[PDB]
Amino acid sequence: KKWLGTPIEEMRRMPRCGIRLPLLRPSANHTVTIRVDLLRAGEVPKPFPTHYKDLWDNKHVKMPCSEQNLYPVRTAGSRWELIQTALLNKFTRPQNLKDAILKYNVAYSKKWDFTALIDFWDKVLEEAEAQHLYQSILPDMVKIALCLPNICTQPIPLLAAAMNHSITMSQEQIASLLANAFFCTFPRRNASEYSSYPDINFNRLFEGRSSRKPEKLKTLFCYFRRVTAAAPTGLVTFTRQSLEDFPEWERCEKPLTRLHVTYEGTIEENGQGMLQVDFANRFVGGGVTSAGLVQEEIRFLINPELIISRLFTEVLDHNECLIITGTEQYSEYTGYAETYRWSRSHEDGSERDDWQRRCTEIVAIDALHFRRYLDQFVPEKMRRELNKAYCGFLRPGVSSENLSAVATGNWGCGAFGGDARLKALIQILAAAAAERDVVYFTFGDSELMRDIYSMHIFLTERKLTVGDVYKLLLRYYNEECRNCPDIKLYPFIYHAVES
After folding, report:
1. Which parts are annotated binding residues?
2. Rg, the chain, Cα only
3. 423 within 8 A of 373, measured Cβ to Cβ
4. Which parts of the sequence bind substrate?
5. Which of 52, 167, 253, 259 is positioned for an S-S bond with 149, CB 3.0–4.6 A?
């Protein structure tokens, strides 16, 4: 058996399941960096406003092209002018690129190791591919980076803690920003005011001798190749979502929803048009442009527009998630972690909604890290994961008929040490409460697929509600965990309900 439960064909997906969007318009909780009156299918969006406006403060991104981005001369010079000068040089050897990046990053001249960049260019690529890199790709990237003040003309607010706020921008604006991140031009983000933000500059991508660095680089250059050659025409929305009230889980009278569970397939392919879970670090993107190459990092590499979330998304608190709609997949891959390789360029065939966003919605929810395995059965811990997932799944002011299924898997398992069987149930309950069906990918674990199916069907047949199940979870803690383990969760739940 390759899958179990409800056929995946019967689950809701976008755009089919969706109601029409309201007119796109800027407001106090929605930043829109393009001319909405001029947004048309197949046309590159026009930036709004027309001319660059700069803000340099603690509420907005600090743009490398700011008049306030200054450097020591002791007189004070325009660092943006320095950046233009440094990057407009001919590169024919990797050291030239390292030298260029360090011209406006002088304090990091010893700290920043560029070994992986040098090794990629010199010891991985063949002569012809190296030539395409320095004659065509890098110069095109520089040019898109340097167009920044003409492309990203509107200040970008930080999505700070507790904010419920969205930023909608064009793929083209994202590409200019990421190109700057590659050349490490973002001021004040190196080493401080941004200790609660992820890194954005790509300096850590260039360090060390991990065998996975070449595969990261190929993945990113495939993106850069494509977006600098032919500007993408769509939009991407980033939404920071906070909930103020969470359910009384013990009393929740909601029934369980449907489940499709399978040990084959992937969220990104088989989960088309569904709410796709990213097993996030609380610093979104995790190790994407350093070391780290599991689920989050892979998705951020194949859909690089996700990476720009790190420019403006503060670390997630327990009640928060980040929702990103409209990122495009640019690469295919195989393997995972130390076996991960870039395979080929991907032509994303996703339809676009009425805001010209690809019909791909990804939610970043960060699981807890458990030092000790039994820590996660503590009720405070279970409740936290339930509320985290619920926040990720809930769409206030949307009726269930218009909500796609959630496509997820073994959230928080592996390095963070979650129990897959407990996490499955927790996601099932959260999705039930948010009135969404669940499509669960076990990634090769056939035994886990049958176990999740069997538990779900068992509880559905017995008409147990979210509350009934949560109460069993608390019983497990109180009877089997706190005085220690002895009996596993699912066996406990079967015997407990059978009586």
Report:
1. 267-268, 281, 295, 336, 410-415
2. 24
3. no
4. 267-268, 281, 295, 336, 410-415
5. 52
Breaks (C-N over 2.5 A) in the chain follow: 73, 191, 484
Contact call for residues 423 and 411 (beta carbons, < 8 A): yes
Return d(Cα 406, Cα 260) in angstroms, integer. 10
Strand partners, 255: 465
Contacts of 186 (CB under 8 A, 6+ apart): 61, 62, 64, 180, 200, 201, 311
Q: Residue 273: which residues within 8 A CB-CB, separation 6 or more?
A: 13, 14, 15, 16, 17, 350, 359, 360, 404
314 is catalytic: no
Strand partners, 70: 78
DSSP assignment, residue 121? I
What whole-number distance in Å separates Cα of residue 287 and Cα of residue 39?
A: 35
Contacting residues for 83 by C-beta, under 8 A, at least 6 apart: 64, 103, 104, 146, 183, 185
- Which amino acid, residue 158? L
Print the domain residue range for 185.
1-499
In the structure encoding, which two tokens stand for residue 488, read together? 């596993």
Spatial contact of 303 and 328, defined as CB atoms under 8 Å apart: yes
* Residue whose pair of structure tokens reads 């959630």 in the numeric block: 406
Question: How many angstroms separate the CA atoms of 140 and 226, rounded?
Answer: 10
- Residue 105 burial (CB count, 10 A): 22
Per annotation, catalytic residue among 172, 278, 419, 451: 278
Output the six-digit token pair for 107: 């304090």
Range list of β-strands (E), 158-234: 165-170
Q: 147: which residues sit within 8 A by CB, 6+ positions away? A: 176
- Please say if 278 is a catalytic residue: yes
- Kindly provide the resolution of this structure in angstroms, with one decimal: 1.8
What residue type is 89 in one-letter code? Answer: N
- Alpha carbons 287 and 292: distance in angstroms, whole number: 4
Q: Determine whether 305 is an active site residue.
A: no
CB neighbour list of residue 163: distance below 8 Å, 6 or more residues apart: 240, 242
Distance CA 413, CA 196 (A): 24
3-state secondary structure at position 136: helix
| Known binding-site positions for substrate | 267-268, 281, 295, 336, 410-415
Q: Name residue 361's beta-bridge partners.
A: 275, 325
* Token pair for 406: 């959630």
- Among candidate residues 215, 297, 328, 419, the one labeled active-site is 297
